[PDB]
Design an enzyme around this catalytic site. Structure first.
Site, PDB file in Angstrom:
ATOM      1  N   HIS A  57      40.464  50.561  45.612  1.00 12.26           N
ATOM      2  CA  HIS A  57      39.732  49.454  45.021  1.00 12.26           C
ATOM      3  C   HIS A  57      40.502  48.959  43.812  1.00 12.26           C
ATOM      4  CE1 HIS A  57      35.904  47.190  44.854  1.00 12.26           C
ATOM      5  NE2 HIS A  57      36.159  47.113  43.557  1.00 12.26           N
ATOM      6  N   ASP A  78      34.355  45.180  37.736  1.00  8.23           N
ATOM      7  CA  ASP A  78      34.395  45.871  39.025  1.00  8.23           C
ATOM      8  C   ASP A  78      33.257  45.316  39.863  1.00  8.23           C
ATOM      9  OD1 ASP A  78      33.427  48.925  40.580  1.00  8.23           O
ATOM     10  OD2 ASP A  78      35.436  48.057  40.850  1.00  8.23           O
ATOM     11  N   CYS A 138      38.678  42.534  46.501  1.00  7.02           N
ATOM     12  CA  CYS A 138      38.635  42.959  45.098  1.00  7.02           C
ATOM     13  C   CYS A 138      39.901  42.550  44.357  1.00  7.02           C
ATOM     14  CB  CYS A 138      38.443  44.471  44.971  1.00  7.02           C
ATOM     15  SG  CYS A 138      39.486  45.442  46.156  1.00  7.02           S
TER      16      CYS A 138
END
Lengths: 188, 77
Positions: free
Chosen positions: A79, A96, A146
């Site tokens: 991620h 995030d 992401c």
């Protein structure tokens, strides 16, 4: 330099890799070098596993505290996330897409900033730091973008543009970033 | 003249090289990757945070004896 296997990570819904992340950050920092410093995606890992002495020489030529904005991409194994530091209000901010791993990241960086301020004799930065969750980046809706949200937020903040993007814009943003790395040229 | 260089991974493993100061570090990148049995393009070599290009020298980068090159693997997310 990038090869096509690096750029291929922007195709479709592929997961972006660090060559895309780090070259795009260098484009941004080249645009506004006196205002922004972009740490590559290996800084936080080196800080975490080897402490301040592992990264102390990475700021050889850099007065971090003259900048306006520090951008620190955070690789969380599967991620991408992002820490931003704005030196005027002394805020350490964390983005995030699920808010996961907030505390460790901002504390790693806050501890680093204090150690740096001490070693570089900048005691006006030993007081006042505050951490925060970045709140109104639009929501990520899939399992693969992401890295694209992170780069888009890097470019908006460094260049002082609003984040007028959302998930539906992300395929076009992949195509834009792909173009910009090919030409080595950020577009407006 | 030769220069001794420590190449260090994130597991704290060290591979020690003795290379010419005037030689391309690409030769060292290739050797390190074969040592670890991984593709060269999946590693990144850093000297004090700076990406080491294939055409770089210890001399051009200002390396001294027993300096450290950090290695990192490709990251995706």
């Amino acid at each position: 330099m990038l090869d096509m296997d690096d750029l291929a990570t922007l195709d479709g819904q592929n997961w972006l890799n660090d060559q895309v992340i780090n070259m795009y950050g260098e484009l941004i920092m080249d645009a506004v070098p006196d205002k922004v410093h972009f740490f590559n995606s290996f800084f936080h890992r080196q800080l975490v596993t080897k402490g301040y002495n592992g990264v102390k020489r990475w700021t050889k030529k850099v007065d971090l505290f003259k900048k306006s904005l520090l951008l620190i991409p955070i690789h969380l194994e599967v991620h991408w996330s992002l820490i931003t530091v704005t030196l005027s209000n002394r805020i350490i901010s964390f983005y995030d897409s699920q808010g996961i791993h907030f505390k460790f990241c901002v504390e790693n960086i806050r501890k680093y900033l204090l150690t740096e301020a001490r070693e570089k004799n900048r005691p006006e930065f030993l007081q006042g730091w505050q951490t925060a969750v970045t709140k109104c980046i639009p929501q990520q809706k899939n399992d693969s973008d992401c890295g694209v949200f992170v780069l888009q937020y890097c470019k908006c903040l460094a260049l002082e543009q609003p984040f007028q993007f959302s998930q539906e814009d992300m395929p076009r943003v992949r195509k834009r970033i792909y173009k910009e790395l090919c030409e080595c040229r950020l577009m407006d | 003249e030769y220069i001794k260089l420590k190449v260090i991974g994130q597991d704290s493993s060290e591979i020690h090289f003795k290379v010419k100061m005037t030689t391309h570090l690409k030769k060292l990148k290739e050797s390190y990757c074969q040592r670890q049995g991984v593709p060269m393009n999946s590693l990144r070599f850093l000297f004090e945070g700076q990406r080491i290009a294939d055409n770089h020298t210890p001399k051009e980068l200002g390396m001294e004896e027993e300096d450290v090159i950090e290695v990192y693997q490709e990251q995706t997310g």
